């Protein structure tokens, strides 16, 4: 744990990136979290929402 000061920076950046990536799995109220899935099932005006 001598280099914990640098390890903390590395871990914080990696954790922020991982959270940003994981945020792509959230529906945010939509039917699906996959853009291709939304576009494959719905025509433009329903898919727009």
């Amino acid at each position: 744990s001598a280099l914990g000061k640098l390890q903390d920076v590395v871990n914080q950046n990696a954790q922020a990136l991982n959270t940003l990536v994981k945020q792509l799995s959230s529906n945010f109220g939509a039917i699906s979290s996959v853009l291709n899935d939304i576009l494959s099932r719905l025509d433009p005006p329903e898919a727009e929402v």
Partner: protein
Amino acid sequence: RKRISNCVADYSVLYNSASFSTFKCYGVSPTKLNDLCFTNVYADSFVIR
């Protein structure tokens, strides 16, 4: 309730058949219905007012 499985479904004819009074789809558009694959289709039929 009828199990529909292990078959190729062509919804284009059903969409084009004008005899239906109501053709409303909720989670998919009828035009895109011919490009999707489902793990199970359950068709429920009844007579109501």
